[PDB]
Amino acid sequence: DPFTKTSLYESTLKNQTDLLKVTQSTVEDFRSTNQSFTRALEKDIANLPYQSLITEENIINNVGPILKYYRHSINALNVYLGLNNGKVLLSQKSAKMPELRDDLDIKTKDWYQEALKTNDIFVTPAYLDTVLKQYVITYSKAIYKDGKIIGVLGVDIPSEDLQNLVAKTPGNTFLFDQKNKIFAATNKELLNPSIDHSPVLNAYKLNGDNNFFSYKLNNEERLGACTKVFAYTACITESADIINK
Numbered sequence: 727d728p729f730t731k732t733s734l735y736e737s738t739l740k741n742q743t744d745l746l747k748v749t750q751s752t753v754e755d756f757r758s759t760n761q762s763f764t765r766a767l768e769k770d771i772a773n774l775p776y777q778s779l780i781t782e783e784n785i786i787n788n789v790g791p792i793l794k795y796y797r798h799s800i801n802a803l804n805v806y807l808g809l810n811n812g813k814v815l816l817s818q819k820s821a822k823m824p825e826l827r828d829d830l831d832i833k834t835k836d837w838y839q840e841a842l843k844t845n846d847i848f849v850t851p852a853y854l855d856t857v858l859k860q861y862v863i864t865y866s867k868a869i870y871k872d873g874k875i876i877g878v879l880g881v882d883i884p885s886e887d888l889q890n891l892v893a894k895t896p897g898n899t900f901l902f903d904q905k906n907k908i909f910a911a912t913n914k915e916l917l918n919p920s921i922d923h924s925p926v927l928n929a930y931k932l933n934g935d936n937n938f939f940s941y942k943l944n945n946e947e948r949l950g951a952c953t954k955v956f957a958y959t960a961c962i963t964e965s966a967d968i969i970n971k
């Protein structure tokens with residue numbers, strides 16, 4: 727009876743919409759927590775007197791402890807300050823104090839370049855950190871003291887941390903990165919690189935953010951929706967058995 731099928735469709739749409747929104751929130755809260763942390767660290771570095779910032783030895787001794795404590799507070803992988811001479815003061819997970827490194831090619835990096843092109847925090851796509859060889863998301867920020875550039879702050883957070891948060895959420899939810907490659911999922915099988923996601927991705931392009939759609943898998947009907955969340959695409963799908971059976 728159409729009345730009953732409509733009531734089941736409306737219910738499951740609501741439920742699945744809610745669950746999609748939980749995954750969206752997870753991504754938003756991960757980002758904003760890292761941004762706030764990065765902003766706080768900027769403020770504490772820029773608060774230092776100029777004298778503490780204008781020789782490399784003073785940067786080591788005065789900025790280094792701040793990087794280390796901040797790193798520990800959030801269990802970041804790397805926290806660092808890159809200078810215009812190409813050196814970077816690096817606090818890395820491993821208890822030796824932070825050291826100035828001249829070998830990390832920092833002006834070639836997008837976290838460095840892009841921080842100098844915006845007054846905001848820059849957020850990288852996930853990429854393989856050169857130092858610890860883990861996949862990270864980097865938050866970077868050009869630090870200025872009274873208009874004068876001190877250097878570019880960077881904070882590397884393992885991308886696994888966001889993957890793990892997403893996976894824990896309820897519902898059959900998943901994320902794609904900017905390249906429409908699968909990035910995270912509640913059901914770990916979706917992460918197989920050989921899975922074709924065109925049906926979902928195509929139905930999302932046709933329907934738009936948060937607009938619920940029908941599609942087929944192995945001749946069976948499924949329901950889903952996606953929405954953009956920053957550069958990511960977040961999706962949920964389920965079997966259409968709830969409305970058909």
Ligand SMILES: CCC(C)(C)[C@H](N)C(=O)O
Nearest residue numbers: 804814830835855856857
């Ligand atoms: C100093 C910059 C490092 C920490 C090496 C950054 N993850 C990068 O890979 O560029």
Ligand SMILES: [Cl-]
Nearest residue numbers: 756757849863
């Ligand atoms: Cl993020």
Ligand code: NA
Nearest residue numbers: 834835836837
């Ligand atoms: Na780069």
Ligand code: NA
Nearest residue numbers: 895896897912
């Ligand atoms: Na989920």
